[PDB]
Amino acid sequence: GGSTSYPCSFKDCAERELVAVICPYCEKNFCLRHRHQSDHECEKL
Ligand SMILES: [Zn+2]
Ligand SMILES: [Zn+2]
Secondary structure, eight states: OOOOOOOOSOTTOOOOOSSOEEOSSSOOEEOHHHHSHHHHOOTTO
16 A cells, blocks of 8 residues: 554554564653653652
């Protein structure tokens, strides 16, 4: 159809990359924008 990728799960997500970064505590795949401790607001910041 068009392109092939697997971005992170979020409503404010507007970035698509090959491999998403893995949080230290959340250990989840996310973009650089959300990767920010302030953006994600990880409880175990
Ligand atoms: Zn994202
Ligand atoms: Zn996190």
